[PDB]
Structure 1
Amino acid sequence: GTLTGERPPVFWLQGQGCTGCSVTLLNSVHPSIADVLLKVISLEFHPTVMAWEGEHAIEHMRKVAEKFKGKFFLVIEGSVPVEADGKYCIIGEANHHEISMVDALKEFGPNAAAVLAVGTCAAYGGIPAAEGSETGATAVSKFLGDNGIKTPVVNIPGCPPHPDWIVGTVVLALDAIKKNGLEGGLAEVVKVLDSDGRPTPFFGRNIHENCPYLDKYDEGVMSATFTDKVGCRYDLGCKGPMTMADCFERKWNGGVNWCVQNAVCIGCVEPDFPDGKSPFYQA
């Protein structure tokens, strides 16, 4: 990119998130996050990093949204809680009126070019929707569907996702749009999503079938302590067999480690995370 190139507007709204999906993106190696912000996208609203604040920040987003109606990208980080008339997540206040996450998604969702549900919470409900919760935490695609909102959704799950999955899905979409225009481009993106809405370049391969300890699994050679790095981690709770992600190859944090080498995979990109992947430390 260039400082002088075309950069589409992005609004990043946090519902029931932990900010981990923003922090993971800050860890992008190639392109660096500086290059993403200055050369790839125009991040017009993001509560963690933007200059302005309060009702002024909300109104700035609304002004951009009107100018780019149908064309902005809406990132959602966290689930959307529907109980108690939306009161479990208030994201702002303007005109003396509080704005719940429910309100915000109903306002901006219909007018986005696409909604990127970043993280397992936004994609599938995640920890806020797990057993023992009581806020009505809802995944983005389900909330939009329940409310008659037809805007395309792309899920980029993980708790957190790898930065390469987030940046790479943006690049996939921008490439498709450059070639085909907005509607033709988004149609080409949808064609490369799996049944759980995940881009197959990143989520189309199984961890276990590509794992370097697979020979030990087949031999029945299982580590009995976490620090034994020779054996397979299945008896310690590894969920690699049920997990679709490319972590075995790209690894984490500049390639320095990944979950299976260090401890176990907990299945963090899967629709049933956490409850269907728990207990974490037994098979």
Structure 2
Amino acid sequence: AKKRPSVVYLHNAECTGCSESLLRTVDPYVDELILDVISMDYHETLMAGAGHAVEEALHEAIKGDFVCVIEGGIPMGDGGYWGKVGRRNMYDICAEVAPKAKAVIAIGTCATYGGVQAAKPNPTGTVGVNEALGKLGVKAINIAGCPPNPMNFVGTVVHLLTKGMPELDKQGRPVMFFGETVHDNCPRLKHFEAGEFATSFGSPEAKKGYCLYELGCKGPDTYNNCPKQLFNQVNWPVQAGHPCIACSEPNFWDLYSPFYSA
């Protein structure tokens, strides 16, 4: 035992968008990271053992100084029996672990706000991380977006063990990344202000880069950094002439939809 900071990665009612998106870090590569940087003490997608052997792992793991990473949001449901691992409910595994970490960090709009599963009627009645582990004194830092963009995560944890508890916004999101809206930093701004919009995807305007307000774009009411860091170091939704759907706002699914209007 020693080396780098123990990290416990928990997978609740997720879809693995957030874990996959993580493997996409650059600068801090996943190898550098998972090796010379952090110490992924528990992570069900990459663990070499299975079942029992890993349960033992977590157990020992959550004994030290560790950072919890919770992907997903919890089915508190009509019991909370919608998600079970090792035969135990996802709430329970969470009530156990979260509370013991120097710091917890909820990844993706599911962990954070409640995600896809939590959309009407929310049959599983799933809710966000620190809206469930709150009563247990958990105050997680939200790395929003469906999924969040490597650096927002990585940069966030780096910030932890380096400087400290990052300044956060109203929705518990690091201001150092979710400060500005999407619109604020979008290129088709020009057209927004000038009044030049596309009225259809297959149209001269659309093809020449007209703003998407019309088509449904939600950059206006969405705080993210996409326009400026951008995905896979090569693109973004709008750059691909597709409306922004507010994938990092507390209730996009049911709020900012229909996603092809307003």
Distance 1:6 1:152, change over 3 A: farther
Query: Residue type matched to 1:10 in 2?
Result: V
Q: Tell me the distance in 2 between the aligned counterparts of 1:5 and 1:134.
A: 44
- 1:105 and 2:94 are equivalent in the alignment: yes
Q: Tell me the distance in 1 between the aligned counterparts of 2:139 and 2:209.
A: 44
Task: Give yes or no for contact 1:11–1:43 (8 Å, CA) kept in 2.
Answer: yes
Query: Residue type matched to 2:213 in 1?
Result: Y
What's the CA shift string for 1:215-261, capped at 9, x where partnerless? 1011221112335242101111110000111111111112x110111
- 1:204 and 2:204 are equivalent in the alignment: no
Task: Give yes or no for contact 1:113–1:152 (8 Å, CA) kept in 2.
Answer: no
Distance 1:166 1:127, change over 3 A: same
What's the CA shift string for 1:56-75, capped at 9, x where partnerless? 10111101212x0xx21111
Alignment map for 1:5-154 (pairs within 5 Å): 6-66=3-63, 68=64, 71-92=65-86, 98-145=87-134, 148-154=135-141
Give the match for residue 191 of structure 2. Answer: 216
Task: Report deviation, 1:152.
Answer: 3.4
Alignment map for 1:188-267 (pairs within 5 Å): 189=166, 192-226=167-201, 227-254=206-233, 256-262=234-240, 263-267=242-246
Q: Tell me the distance in 2 between the aligned counterparts of 1:134 and 1:267.
A: 23
SS of 2:32's partner is helix
Is there any run of 5+ residues in structure 2 with no aligned partner, and where? none
SS of 2:102's partner is strand
Query: Residue type matched to 1:107 in 2?
Result: E
Greater percentage in helix: 1
Task: Report deviation, 1:79.
Answer: 1.2
TM superposition score normalised by structure 1? 0.87
Structure 1 counterpart of 2:148, from 143, 161, 165: 161
SS of 2:123's partner is coil
What's the CA shift string for 1:130-159, capped at 9, x where partnerless? 1122111011011012xx311331100110
Number of residue pairs aligned between Structure 1 and Structure 2: 257
Task: Give yes or no for contact 1:26–1:33 (8 Å, CA) kept in 2.
Answer: yes
Distance 1:22 1:55, change over 3 A: same
The alignment's C-alpha RMSD in Å is 1.5
Task: Report deviation, 1:5.
Answer: 8.3
Task: Give yes or no for contact 2:8–2:61 (8 Å, CA) kept in 1.
Answer: no
Query: Residue type matched to 1:202 in 2?
Result: F
TM superposition score normalised by structure 2? 0.94
Task: Report deviation, 1:170.
Answer: 0.5
Alignment map for 1:178-197 (pairs within 5 Å): 185-186=164-165, 189=166, 192-197=167-172
